[PDB]
Amino acid sequence: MKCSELWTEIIPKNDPNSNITNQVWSCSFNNDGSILLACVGDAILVYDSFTGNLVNKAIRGGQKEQINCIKFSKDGKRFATASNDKTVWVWSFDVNKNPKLAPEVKYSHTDKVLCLAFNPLTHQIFSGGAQDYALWTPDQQSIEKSKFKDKIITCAWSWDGLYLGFGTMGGIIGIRNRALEQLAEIQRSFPIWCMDWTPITPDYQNSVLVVGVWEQSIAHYNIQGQQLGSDKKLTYDPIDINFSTQGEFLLVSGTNNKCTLYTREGGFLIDVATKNDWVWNNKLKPVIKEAGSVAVQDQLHVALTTNDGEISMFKIQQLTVHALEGDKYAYRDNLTDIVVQSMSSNQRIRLKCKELVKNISIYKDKLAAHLTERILIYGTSSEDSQMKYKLHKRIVKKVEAHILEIVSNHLIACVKNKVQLYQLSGDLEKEWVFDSRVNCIKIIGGMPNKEGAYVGLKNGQIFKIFVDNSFPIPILNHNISIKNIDASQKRKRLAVVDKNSNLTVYDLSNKEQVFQEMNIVSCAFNNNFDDLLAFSSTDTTFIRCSNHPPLSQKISGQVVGFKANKLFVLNDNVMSTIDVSMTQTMIKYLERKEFQSAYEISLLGVTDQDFLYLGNEALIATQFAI
Amino acid sequence: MFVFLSKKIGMPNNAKIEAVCWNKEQGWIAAGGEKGILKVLKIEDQRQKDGSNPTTTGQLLVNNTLEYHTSNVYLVTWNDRYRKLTSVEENGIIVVWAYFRELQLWKEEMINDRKKSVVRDLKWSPDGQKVCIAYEDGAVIVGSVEGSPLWRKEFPHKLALIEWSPDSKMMIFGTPEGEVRVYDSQGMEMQRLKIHCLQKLIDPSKSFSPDLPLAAIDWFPQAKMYTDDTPPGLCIAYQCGRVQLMKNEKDDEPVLIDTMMKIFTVKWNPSGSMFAISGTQDENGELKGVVQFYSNAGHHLKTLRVPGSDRVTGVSWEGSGLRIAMAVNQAIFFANIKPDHKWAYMSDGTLAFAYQKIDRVEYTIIFWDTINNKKNLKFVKNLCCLRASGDLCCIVTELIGYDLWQIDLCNSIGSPIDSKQINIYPNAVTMTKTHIIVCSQDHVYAWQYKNQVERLTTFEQQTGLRRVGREQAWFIDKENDSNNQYDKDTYDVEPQSEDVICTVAANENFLLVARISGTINVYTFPHISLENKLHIQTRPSQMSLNKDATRLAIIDHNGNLNILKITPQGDELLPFEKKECWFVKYSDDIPESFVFMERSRMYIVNDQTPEEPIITEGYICQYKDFQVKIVYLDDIMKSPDGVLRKEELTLEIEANILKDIKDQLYKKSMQEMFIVIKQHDNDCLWRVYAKKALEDNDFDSAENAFVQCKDYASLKFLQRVRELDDRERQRAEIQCYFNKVEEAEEIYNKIERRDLSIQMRMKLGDWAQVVDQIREGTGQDVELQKARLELGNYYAE
Amino acid sequence: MAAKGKQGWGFGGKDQNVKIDTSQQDQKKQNIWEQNNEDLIFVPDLTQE
């Protein structure tokens, strides 16, 4: 969701009165991603992906003309440099060897070379220029050159290694086999610039050709040449098309000087950068997953090349949105997915959407999915232990809100400094306007059409909202901005955290700062005893009772929920349950002769030995009922 | 895992056996002979009822010969979807049979034969709907089950080996010269595989076409073919040399395995956990028939050697994968396999069982209560180790991508408590009453989860510094002194020692660490410091520690077992022999008695005096007082409908001492048994004597047993009972005292006077039952109202 | 015996294809601990535009 620049290297060596320019055309990326390439007029540039610095000095004089394309070999061992000198060089590459790069095999066409592609499996080279296309096989070292009628502009080998696809500015798209025969021909009326093959996938296991035409369209073509009928329209003319690994994303660049991201279906997600100029080539960092590896893999890396001569690197990080009400934990998986996990049996349930999910809120046996310009609601069959989800209703209305919640027969959306109440049909019902941005909102239970809520503002004043009152009730005031709020089981106290990670406990009956704590990341209240408060810092979690010394665990994670003899700890995006011994508070309560509260604490599932000890203590002190 | 031998089916007519096929759904093993001798028969069950079969089975259920052939047969294939059986000869005659519901009669249904050609390898599709037939000429014929020929193509290159993909979409060819080619289902060439396995043997210039013939290529079915994050599922072996494993056909980084044998046949597991390679080995100085088992990653788990000095050709697995049929010369040997079967047993009675899914990556843990018959389930992605203690269980799992291992504790239900993370590879893990010790190849890690007396050292607020609940980690070679608290980033693992460790044992105050060279190091728990250095000739494998730490049992890698007496800087080996032992366990109550099980035979040994063996096909759970608990995990794996009964799985075996004591009790009088029990003076014997005395309604003997047991509550109970008048209230109260309230209620109903029943039910604290009893019984308003108020309070709490 | 006794899969000259019955089908029942692997159920989204 957040896109941050990493490192930028600019090439200002413009040379007027010379055909060599400062533009950059292509940027090849290694499969591992430890090395990066770029091509400039009369030179090549080698970069480190993580930090921007030339590992090797710029090579000059090898090709007397510009460099049109640079590609790897899917194994990080070969170079292919095509130049306007009517020649293609193939270099050997190896990081550990003293010569990191050195020319290996050079050949030449009859005219200038324009595009080049590699074979993922057999590592064969297909180079297409004006009037000619050539195929090179490493084993035989004998090139096969053939003539054409117009200059090919783009080529791409299928991930199966069997098919080949090329495009011409005359509008002709040709699909051939490894023997270079006219398997399929398609005639269009606009030039062809960008082509790609969809990656193989166990869910799909079929390869189709995605080609971006200059009539503001992207088309999907089958092997036989029959179009799939998508013909998705675009506002801008595309220039480059790149598919992420496993066929999950699609990076599209071109006119309007913007680099945008899309799903494979065509749903817009975000834009990466606006370079104020045409972006000739953008590439995505490949990723390698181990056998059964566990990782969120939220991080993404892109490399962009602009027409001015800037080779920039951007890092995209996806934020975490999740919801937890009871016995269920619904969190957003890899984008366009919702996973509901049960804390007891660790079983998961997956719901797949096509557009990006923005907010997930779960009420009693009701799950609300907030898709782009769509709202979905799913229910649960309570009688069966396993949950069955069925779509009762769908909302087509477009609603924008950074926070969305669902209550019985109503929906609440927070946008800017306003709160909107939506009926399930879709029509707006009620409005609330506050001075500053509404940061955090908490929903408390109640009757249908009468559910209250707490609202925190950027100023810090904490307000209460009722559905039918339409008049905010000022609860209290806080000087610093509010980040998160919580309410006690009996609505007796309220814990509020400021932007400085400062935790404060306010009594509702008497507005007084009873408790203050520094460096607090999260906090939670018990749902059965109403008194225990568990707050987690960056490394240590503390549980505190009434007028008692704190207890430390050195538990790695953040506290999300507290239930009877249970604490939920969430690390990264997976969470677990930890049991807590209640003997310490038992003994402390026994010290002050408060047998009722001690028995209430003991009722939270303590060992039978402590039950016997409490029974003996109560019997000695003449308390026969306990 | 362990492997041993079993029944040996004899020669049919003194003819060599070279092809054996075992069905998966029903048990029908077939062997081919020399002069057209095809025999299909059923095999004896491994476990029958809950004991040894009086007839010992010993009956060949079918055992019928289907000859029809004058020449020899060397390809016999079973259809698993249907009853079809395919068999070919040297003269290119392919015959397909089917089963008709008559007196075990198989008759021909396909009689096809192509002349002037030689058949090499026939294959069936995993779905069972296609047949691929290839010859040495090059022609490939694909036929449906019905009989319609899909296509009969001709190939220029000669063909030697045929394999099918799990999805049957495409196939793999291997030429006699040696090379792998990928073809589609329509006979079109896709590509040629590259071999990195054969190093220094191939021609340096070209590697696609070496001069080494292919032994066997095998693709494990039910495995993903369009993914990269999966354990390897395809294997390619050459005639004698290296074998390579690939997780996919397009993989360019295969896993290498080298074995010093002539590979003849490689067969995968029904579950895919391990694969067996059969053939001949010359390491013993001559030709010895061997079968080597390898994991999916490849670790050479075990090696089975046949008594005969000859070849081992043809290996088949049972449907469940518990038995192996191996055709050696003129016999079909049956090898029995006992897998690892990660399982844990608590003193609560809960049993934790780990089951592997078909993904081979994910595991399911079942917590089954042996008393209340409850069943809870948990899903754990990766499992490395599972261990149990009196009331807690330890799970050691691995996180991929961080090279870390998570060790967590779980109660009977399975709620995690105080999970920790380490960077130490769990080569060998143990967990005693108050510690958890995990040992890598060269590092040792200890962690305290309980304090000195009895309490969890996770919630403590007294001293600023860490007093109880500290984690230590040290080296094996040097740095004997224990280090301070380690971290997942501060601690270093890079240094390596020449003498690696193999097994570790723990006690209440002692720790033992073994070494491969034959050295055992002793450590004390209050402050870790080496004291003794024991010497053992052979490397230990399992090891065990006796209560009080007086003796120990050493099991060698070859299976030999002996007893070692631990003494200050000494070495005493008590002569016991008893080779080929597999399981050993010392009693936790009797300092001397122990149980060891050898080749599916259990022996109870005390003071180096063994007893009669007992045939058992289960695993030993615990050795409690004069009792051994065994559980059959194989039937747990094979449950029909999801009900587990403690009367079927769990079995209890009593020692001869307890049996003799019970016999003398049920036969002889009371005073003689009292003086007989006096010498033994054991808690269980006194408890049983008191129970019997109370059952016969005798109080004097019960009082004597209770004073000898030193139990004040029992004396108070007996004193309360003795002041009674009738004969019925005493029995009912005794029944309620033991564990049984229903019997007491029934006898109360027999004697009527239900107010005692209602008062006892109120006293015991069950409020639903008294509410049920009072309804429509007497109509008492006040009692019913009070009972309902108490029930409401109980439900609210 | 050779109840049918006819060349199959197009091996002879004269077309003499056989008919083999495919009525008795043997299937393997999945284990219940294995049958609990499907807890991760797939739910597509209702795409009616």
Side-chain angles (χ1 to χ4, degrees), chain B residues 470-473 482-486:
Chain B
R470 303 150 78 184
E471 318 151 82
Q472 282 114 325
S482 179
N483 289 336
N484 288 334
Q485 292 73 350
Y486 69 105

PDB file of all heavy atoms in Angstrom, chain B residues 470-473 482-486:
ATOM      1  N   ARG B 470      15.805 -20.322  33.394  1.00  0.00           N
ATOM      2  CA  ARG B 470      16.877 -19.830  32.544  1.00  0.00           C
ATOM      3  C   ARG B 470      17.239 -20.877  31.502  1.00  0.00           C
ATOM      4  O   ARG B 470      17.106 -22.083  31.731  1.00  0.00           O
ATOM      5  CB  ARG B 470      18.112 -19.469  33.373  1.00  0.00           C
ATOM      6  CG  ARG B 470      17.841 -18.444  34.457  1.00  0.00           C
ATOM      7  CD  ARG B 470      18.769 -18.639  35.640  1.00  0.00           C
ATOM      8  NE  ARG B 470      20.101 -18.108  35.378  1.00  0.00           N
ATOM      9  CZ  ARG B 470      21.126 -18.216  36.212  1.00  0.00           C
ATOM     10  NH1 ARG B 470      21.009 -18.836  37.375  1.00  0.00           N
ATOM     11  NH2 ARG B 470      22.298 -17.688  35.871  1.00  0.00           N
ATOM     12  N   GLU B 471      17.700 -20.402  30.352  1.00  0.00           N
ATOM     13  CA  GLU B 471      18.045 -21.257  29.227  1.00  0.00           C
ATOM     14  C   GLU B 471      19.554 -21.236  29.025  1.00  0.00           C
ATOM     15  O   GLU B 471      20.161 -20.161  28.966  1.00  0.00           O
ATOM     16  CB  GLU B 471      17.334 -20.790  27.956  1.00  0.00           C
ATOM     17  CG  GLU B 471      15.884 -20.374  28.123  1.00  0.00           C
ATOM     18  CD  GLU B 471      15.474 -19.316  27.111  1.00  0.00           C
ATOM     19  OE1 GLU B 471      15.144 -19.684  25.964  1.00  0.00           O
ATOM     20  OE2 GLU B 471      15.486 -18.117  27.462  1.00  0.00           O
ATOM     21  N   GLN B 472      20.156 -22.419  28.922  1.00  0.00           N
ATOM     22  CA  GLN B 472      21.593 -22.561  28.752  1.00  0.00           C
ATOM     23  C   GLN B 472      21.901 -23.284  27.447  1.00  0.00           C
ATOM     24  O   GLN B 472      21.117 -24.106  26.966  1.00  0.00           O
ATOM     25  CB  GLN B 472      22.210 -23.326  29.929  1.00  0.00           C
ATOM     26  CG  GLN B 472      22.391 -22.495  31.188  1.00  0.00           C
ATOM     27  CD  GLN B 472      21.516 -22.974  32.330  1.00  0.00           C
ATOM     28  OE1 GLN B 472      20.389 -23.424  32.118  1.00  0.00           O
ATOM     29  NE2 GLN B 472      22.032 -22.882  33.550  1.00  0.00           N
ATOM     30  N   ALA B 473      23.062 -22.969  26.876  1.00  0.00           N
ATOM     31  CA  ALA B 473      23.484 -23.590  25.621  1.00  0.00           C
ATOM     32  C   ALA B 473      25.006 -23.576  25.575  1.00  0.00           C
ATOM     33  O   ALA B 473      25.618 -22.518  25.746  1.00  0.00           O
ATOM     34  CB  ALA B 473      22.889 -22.857  24.424  1.00  0.00           C
ATOM     35  N   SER B 482      29.006 -24.255  32.052  1.00  0.00           N
ATOM     36  CA  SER B 482      27.769 -23.772  31.455  1.00  0.00           C
ATOM     37  C   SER B 482      27.837 -22.267  31.223  1.00  0.00           C
ATOM     38  O   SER B 482      28.367 -21.516  32.045  1.00  0.00           O
ATOM     39  CB  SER B 482      26.580 -24.114  32.353  1.00  0.00           C
ATOM     40  OG  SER B 482      25.369 -23.624  31.805  1.00  0.00           O
ATOM     41  N   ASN B 483      27.296 -21.832  30.089  1.00  0.00           N
ATOM     42  CA  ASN B 483      27.293 -20.425  29.723  1.00  0.00           C
ATOM     43  C   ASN B 483      26.068 -19.738  30.327  1.00  0.00           C
ATOM     44  O   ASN B 483      25.280 -20.346  31.056  1.00  0.00           O
ATOM     45  CB  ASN B 483      27.341 -20.276  28.204  1.00  0.00           C
ATOM     46  CG  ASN B 483      28.690 -20.649  27.624  1.00  0.00           C
ATOM     47  OD1 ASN B 483      29.711 -20.593  28.310  1.00  0.00           O
ATOM     48  ND2 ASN B 483      28.702 -21.034  26.352  1.00  0.00           N
ATOM     49  N   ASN B 484      25.899 -18.456  30.023  1.00  0.00           N
ATOM     50  CA  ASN B 484      24.770 -17.684  30.517  1.00  0.00           C
ATOM     51  C   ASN B 484      23.610 -17.785  29.528  1.00  0.00           C
ATOM     52  O   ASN B 484      23.611 -18.618  28.617  1.00  0.00           O
ATOM     53  CB  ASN B 484      25.188 -16.236  30.764  1.00  0.00           C
ATOM     54  CG  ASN B 484      26.079 -16.088  31.981  1.00  0.00           C
ATOM     55  OD1 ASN B 484      26.031 -16.903  32.902  1.00  0.00           O
ATOM     56  ND2 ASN B 484      26.897 -15.042  31.991  1.00  0.00           N
ATOM     57  N   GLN B 485      22.598 -16.939  29.711  1.00  0.00           N
ATOM     58  CA  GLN B 485      21.452 -16.930  28.812  1.00  0.00           C
ATOM     59  C   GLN B 485      21.893 -16.571  27.401  1.00  0.00           C
ATOM     60  O   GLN B 485      22.640 -15.611  27.192  1.00  0.00           O
ATOM     61  CB  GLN B 485      20.399 -15.933  29.303  1.00  0.00           C
ATOM     62  CG  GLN B 485      19.698 -16.313  30.605  1.00  0.00           C
ATOM     63  CD  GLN B 485      20.578 -16.155  31.836  1.00  0.00           C
ATOM     64  OE1 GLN B 485      21.784 -15.926  31.734  1.00  0.00           O
ATOM     65  NE2 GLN B 485      19.970 -16.268  33.010  1.00  0.00           N
ATOM     66  N   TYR B 486      21.426 -17.348  26.433  1.00  0.00           N
ATOM     67  CA  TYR B 486      21.778 -17.154  25.037  1.00  0.00           C
ATOM     68  C   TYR B 486      20.638 -16.419  24.337  1.00  0.00           C
ATOM     69  O   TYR B 486      19.553 -16.236  24.893  1.00  0.00           O
ATOM     70  CB  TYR B 486      22.014 -18.495  24.343  1.00  0.00           C
ATOM     71  CG  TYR B 486      20.724 -19.243  24.211  1.00  0.00           C
ATOM     72  CD1 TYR B 486      20.088 -19.329  22.985  1.00  0.00           C
ATOM     73  CD2 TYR B 486      20.098 -19.793  25.314  1.00  0.00           C
ATOM     74  CE1 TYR B 486      18.889 -19.971  22.850  1.00  0.00           C
ATOM     75  CE2 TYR B 486      18.902 -20.429  25.186  1.00  0.00           C
ATOM     76  CZ  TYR B 486      18.296 -20.522  23.951  1.00  0.00           C
ATOM     77  OH  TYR B 486      17.088 -21.162  23.802  1.00  0.00           O
TER      78      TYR B 486
END
